[PDB]
């Protein structure tokens, strides 16, 4: 049986947030959810979190997922290790301890790492990585055979000790039983450390192993935005990578922002600077422009997205949309819908094949099939109190520059004359003109500041 | 005599893609392009291009620079060499034999493998590469002299051998005479490979030598997105520095798009994440702001593209565009042209000075010198079935928020009111009004939704 | 007593410019100007900058921060000292010999510099870097105590020299006095260079020591524009870094463009790709996101700025403003104001609470509080020869499409219907009509092109 226990009651200050740390999000999920995901892969019988600091909203992300437990202060990594005590003392198995501010460690690295420890009989092991520069970390110090004898820390550390490029990433498998005692033994002996168990098990003679990152970026610990930002661009190129190998074409996966769990059919070309976020999926060839920003939408297959920002709406297939739209939240775009620049449609429901290609707003519409709205059309939906909806039936023309005051309907193959301003029904294969009527008046330009006389 | 063959008749399964493997893009021109390009450096006699898998996509990239030869099915890299033997057998000279997956192979690295194979009278010369991480090339032994003794696979490896960093990149140049009877030679004691031919060198003890790539990354054989994408960076790099040696600054060079043939003059100024696709030309002195999309199209000296998208149009001297404005296909914006925020022209004609600053539709139109579009005009050319023209003077006075119905035209000076529609001429120096009358009625807001008192 | 001597005096040719290089910016700000703020550190008694090519305008940047001299003509770096002779002869202190082409070296460096000078009583300091690819730079010959023995060029090395990886970044802090009593030795016995000083003083048997940075990139010298452009990424890597230490997250800081001056304030969130130019000042929790572009402009906090341009302008607390939205010069947005899609503002005022939802223009117009303008807005306030403003109370509701052709005055509470041409004042409390009737005519579509059965 495996177990997990996930330390989330950071407190610490080079965030400068009011938001708990292990909640600051990394390609738009929490850190803290990242390490639940990986803390998955050894399919724990429990897990439990350690809360401490505004715990509830900490409480809220893994609602369901976790058992939680609560350090009243910070005391050390032993005394949280310790609030897990009634929950996980007397178990047999094998306790992962990990902490929610590692966000890159793999499921694949923490199964590799709970194999380790089964494989060698160990009774504790460390999760270790090897860097050049290992100034600040605690040391891992191997006899030859070679088993762990023990971690020193930087001020602690002698000289010769300095040098050694194989650090504590402050993740660890324990025997869990062994571990429960050791803490006991630790606390009615005594801030305390996770680190003092290793002590007492070399004091034992119990078998403590080192099983080593291949990636030493997968153990960053991130206490600032910096690193913060550093986790981003590892996540990414993860994330972009995985794409990649499925199918999907990248002008520049290393400035391409796609969340975690955003899904991506083969054959999608992707230019750089696009922005995939939420719940998003987008369907077999489809292309995605530079500056394209898609938030929990559906899009289909073989779709054109030109720069444009599409917010919880759904897209058919064959859809053009762009350069410079906005598709705002509960729109959905049928098939071979083609959406141009400068137009927004929120709230509305657009039946294939229909165009809307300059200049418009579509608010609070149900819109049929072969629709063709000219350049600077405005749908007029609210009045200051009251939304309404207008209806438009198939294959209406409704002209260039024109003002659809709702609650109206536009009947099947009806049309608005271009300038229109339009307040009542129009009947199925009616037309509807409201507009003033062109009078010249020759001469006159003469004498107005335009004219070139008059320069 | 140098000869080149090209082998592109590539099966293999990781692009996932119904696109030939060769044909996927880089900086705007297939792989199998940017190797035809560097196979042009040797000046070769001849070119001949094993097709294979949708030959005549292939066919149709390359029509009129190459031969092309067809093999049939999968058989090694040797038989796809052999099906170029009725093309170059028996001729004297040196013959390249490359693969059309490696597009960043310079023109300058291979006249120097060509030189190299001449001046020390190998009978063939592998180019090679130097990497840290050889897992999975052959490998170059060499003796003391330092002459290649063989090529080692990975899965024949011994261990010592496993630590040579030298590779092969699999490109050679071979004497052409010798390389078809050794050819022949493999074929009847016979998948076969061109590796084997270095077998057959070695058993005549006749010279097999080794020219080493100063740069690795230009090695790279491109089997999936993952490693397209990494081209992709390297050919932005390449092109981006050639600007930049030129004198055009880049904010961020990194983060710019610039395809292969577009030409820019001294002194531009881009900023980072602009796009120039296809054949494109920019001129002397001309700012480009991030965001900005230009497609095939010539924009002029002293212009300032803010954030805008250009497609197949010419845009003369000292032009203004943006920022958010959309120049479509086959329009011409004279000198001293400006195009704000929010404007769309296509198909049109716009003559020198002439300005529309926001929220403007001009769409197939013959536009004067001098003229101004109010915000909000919107020129109105398609009824359902005709497009049509219109033919705007020097001077014209569009007014606000118009509408013009097309086919009309705007005589020289003449001025369309604001708010107007337009459906018939206006002639030189008139003017045209075609808009409602404003009644006011005291009080009446009162009663209205947005009323503070009603609230 | 510190001085310090900038050498800005630049003539070479692989800038292709006809701006001085000096000149060139780097996030917002010279070459040269960086040079002077690091210079500042160091708290000099006389700054001293040397110019030559188009002396007037380095002068115009560093007028009333330093004195200048003028060397006439390219003769070295010694001259260019000597320059400053009558300015710094005799005077007792330590001074500092910097070109304005080395933009990134630090102020901490230089206080590094001059610490490490005073303490080891040397007469010379050069400030050296270590680089692995050390070709083309002057050498550091050391003896084992291990003092400066001499500088030597590439031209000039010994093959064992050439293996030295300790270079001269052409920065040095001299001894004043001596500085100038050798040059003039030199000057009398002969281009000379600076380097000739350590030259007389090795004679002399006097102290010549040599402070190595710790980074290398630190040390770069800007010959072109791809120097440039590696300085731009390494000032971005710097401000941004600061930026996230000060509590600003950054979806990308590799990508992100900040100048030098620009102000954030902590738990700011910013996406990938976006620009803040010159003195722009950035509230707390204001979320930018990705292509957002802000010039010269106060925005408050709790604002959200979605992919938009705001210039020269002030923007309150809690303002929204975007997707593709334009805030041209001299703009107020109160709090709490709406700015929504494709909606230019240029040169107005914006009471609090007011909505700009889509397609609109304020151009020139003083807006009280609350005030609505429906989708597709035009205010109308130029001529062809005068501007004209606008004033709009509180609480106005201006309807969908209409015109508002200025000097116009609506009053607080008044409303103008959906699309209205307006041409007069709207008093307090009143409405304004100003649009053209709907008359519906049966059946007619039947004839028109757009309808199904005429397909
Ligand atoms: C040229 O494109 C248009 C022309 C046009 O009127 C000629 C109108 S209109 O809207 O003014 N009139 C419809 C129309 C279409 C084709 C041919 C003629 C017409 N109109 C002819 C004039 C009108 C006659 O009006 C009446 O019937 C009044 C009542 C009476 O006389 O009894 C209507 C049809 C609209 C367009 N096109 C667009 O608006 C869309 C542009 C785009 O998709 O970007
Ligand atoms: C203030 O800017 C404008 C005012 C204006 O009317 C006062 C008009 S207008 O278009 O309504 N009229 C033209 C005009 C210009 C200057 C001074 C006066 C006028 N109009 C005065 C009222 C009109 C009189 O109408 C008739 O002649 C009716 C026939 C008769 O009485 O016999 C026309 C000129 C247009 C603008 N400006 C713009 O549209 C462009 C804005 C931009 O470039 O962003
Ligand atoms: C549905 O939203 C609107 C309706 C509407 O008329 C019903 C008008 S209107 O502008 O045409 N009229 C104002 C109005 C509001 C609510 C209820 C009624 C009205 N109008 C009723 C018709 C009008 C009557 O006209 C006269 O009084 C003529 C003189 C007379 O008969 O004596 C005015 C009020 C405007 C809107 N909304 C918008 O423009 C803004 C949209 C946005 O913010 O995106």
Do not use: W
């Not at 439990?48 to 609602?63: D, F, I, Q, R, Y």
């Not at 050390?76 to 990990?98: K, N, Q, R, W």
């Not at 939906?381 to 209406?396: A, E, L, M, P, S």
């Not at 005051?405 to 009616?430: F, M, Q, R, Y």
Request: a negative charge; hydrophobic letters at 35%; glycine letters at 10%.
């Amino acid at each position: 049986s495996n177990f997990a226990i996930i330390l989330a009651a950071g407190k610490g200050t080079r965030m400068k947030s009011d938001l708990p740390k292990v909640l600051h999000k990394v390609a738009g999920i929490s850190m803290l959810e990242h390490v639940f995901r990986s803390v998955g892969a050894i399919q724990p019988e429990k897990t439990v979190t350690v809360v401490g600091h505004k715990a509830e909203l900490v409480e809220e992300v893994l609602a369901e997922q976790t058992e939680f437990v609560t350090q009243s202060e910070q005391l050390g990594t032993g005394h949280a290790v310790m609030m897990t005590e009634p929950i996980l003392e007397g178990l047999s198995g094998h306790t992962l301890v990990i902490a929610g501010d590692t966000p890159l460690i793999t499921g694949e690295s923490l199964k590799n790492l709970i194999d380790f420890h089964i494989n060698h009989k160990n009774v504790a092991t460390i999760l270790t990585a090897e860097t050049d520069n290992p100034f600040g970390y605690g040391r891992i110090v191997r006899n030859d055979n070679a088993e762990v004898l023990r971690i020193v820390e930087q001020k602690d550390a002698t000289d010769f000790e300095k040098q050694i490029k194989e650090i504590n990433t402050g993740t660890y498998v324990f025997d869990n039983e062994r571990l429960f005692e050791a803490l006991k033994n630790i606390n009615t002996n005594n801030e305390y450390y996770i680190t003092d168990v290793i002590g007492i098990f070399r004091e034992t003679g119990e078998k403590v192993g080192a099983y080593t990152l291949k990636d030493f970026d997968e153990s960053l610990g991130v206490n600032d935005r910096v690193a913060l930002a550093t986790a981003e661009s590892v996540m990414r190129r993860r994330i972009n990578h995985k794409h990649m190998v499925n199918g999907v074409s990248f002008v520049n996966p290393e400035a391409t922002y796609i969340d975690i769990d955003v899904e991506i059919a083969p054959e999608v070309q992707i230019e750089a600077n696009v922005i995939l976020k939420g719940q998003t999926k987008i369907g077999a060839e489809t292309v995605l422009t530079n500056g394209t920003y898609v938030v929990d939408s559906t899009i289909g297959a073989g779709a054109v997205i030109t720069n444009s920002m599409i917010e919880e709406s759904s897209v058919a297939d064959g859809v053009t949309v762009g350069p410079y739209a906005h598709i705002r939240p509960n729109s959905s775009l049928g098939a071979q819908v083609h959406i141009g620049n400068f137009v927004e449609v929120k709230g509305s429901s657009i039946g294939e094949n229909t165009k809307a290609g300059h200049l418009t707003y579509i608010g609070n519409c149900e819109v049929g099939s072969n629709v063709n709205f000219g350049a600077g059309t405005i749908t007029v939906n609210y009045d200051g109190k009251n939304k309404y909806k207008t209806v438009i039936g198939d294959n209406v023309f409704v002209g260039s520059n024109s003002t659809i005051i709702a609650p109206v309907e536009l009947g099947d193959n009806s049309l608005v004359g271009a300038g229109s301003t339009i307040t009542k029904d129009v009947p199925a294969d009616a037309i509807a003109i409201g507009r003033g009527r062109q009078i010249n008046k020759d001469e006159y330009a003469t004498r107005l500041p335009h004219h070139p006389k008059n320069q």
